[PDB]
Amino acid sequence: DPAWWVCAIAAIECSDV
Amino acid sequence: ENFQKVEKIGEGTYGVVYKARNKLTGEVVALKKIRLDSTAIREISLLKELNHPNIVKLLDVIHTENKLYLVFEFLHQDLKKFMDASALTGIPLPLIKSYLFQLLQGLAFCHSHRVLHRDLKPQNLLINTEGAIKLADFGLARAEVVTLWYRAPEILLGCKYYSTAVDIWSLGCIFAEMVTRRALFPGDSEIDQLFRIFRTLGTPDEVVWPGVTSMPDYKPSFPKWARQDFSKVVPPLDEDGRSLLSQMLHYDPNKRISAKAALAHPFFQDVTKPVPHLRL
Ligand SMILES: *CC(=O)Nc1ccc(NC(=O)C*)cc1
Ligand SMILES: [N]
């Protein structure tokens, strides 16, 4: 499984608009 | 799932730093997002292979589209902010000695692997609550005004070969700044940087630095200043500390003390690992 912080990057990418 | 908590930590220069916590497990990591416009990834990723207690643990380097995410262990503060907080009182000298000792440990490890930082400054040095300090931000520049005060003279003179001695120069400048609470050579240009060095250490010549007059940016019209007394430059540093600093700031990079040799210096022989005097 990937590390948990994969979601933290997904969240920053999502909120970088 | 919104099972984590991501928050902006601030800063600029290269990028934005973030703190991420895993709510279920409590785990915390730091993240630095830095934009682009592949040589960077190569040099930045090598730090995943360099494991040392005085080097920040780089968990991963992630190239997504036109951004670069650096994942690393979460340390609470950098040395520049700690110096600012300590400006009124000063950092206790046992702590300065420990931090310098630990940083020379990390550079000895880097330099034994023929890996150079090249851009050392207080902003790149991270500390925790237990008394450790760690080198960070290797290779980021690959992805100048801020870095200028800590640049070794051979770089300012246009030399094309950077030895491990450029990191020892930069650390010497950080050593002096911790002791005096002021930057040692705060230049506002490459030539002002050089001249501030010349006014303190004396204008270099072929006697003190063989080959200096043949470097790309050396000019015989350089003003000729005499060397200053270190007792005037870094008071009230003790004789041992002054001896070490002066060997860290020889002009000739081959004469500049190595990280390993510096660890054996009498300055360090009562070194301990005290916890930060502040809540940092
Ligand atoms: C693992 C995980 O939670 N990933 C993830 C994906 C998307 C987002 N949010 C948006 O895309 C807006 C958060 C986390
Ligand atoms: N944005």
Numbering used by the authors:
A (entry chain B): 1 to 17
B (entry chain A): 1 to 37, 45 to 150, 161 to 297
Question: Can I see the authors' text?
Answer:
CDK2 is a protein target of high therapeutic interest due to its role in cell cycle progression and its implication in CyclinE1-mediated resistance to CDK4/6-inhibitor treated cancers, but it has historically been challenging to develop CDK2-selective inhibitors, particularly using small molecules, due to the close similarity of CDK2 with other CDK family members, particularly CDK1. Whereas the ATP-binding pockets of CDK2 and CDK1 are highly similar, their surfaces share significantly less sequence identity, allowing the possibility that Helicons that engage the CDK2 surface may be capable of differentiating between the two family members. Consistent with the selectivity observed in the phage screen, the FP19711 binding site is found at a region on the CDK2 surface where there is high divergence from CDK1. These results highlight the utility of exploiting surface binding to achieve selectivity between closely related proteins when selectivity is difficult to achieve with small-molecule ligands.
To target disease-causing proteins that are inaccessible to small-molecule or antibody therapies, we are exploring the use of a nature-inspired drug modality that exploits the intrinsically favorable properties of synthetically constrained α-helical polypeptides (Helicons). Biochemical and structural experiments demonstrate diverse functional impacts by the Helicons which bind these sites, including inhibition of protein–protein interactions, inhibition of enzymatic activity, induced conformational rearrangement, and induced dimerization.
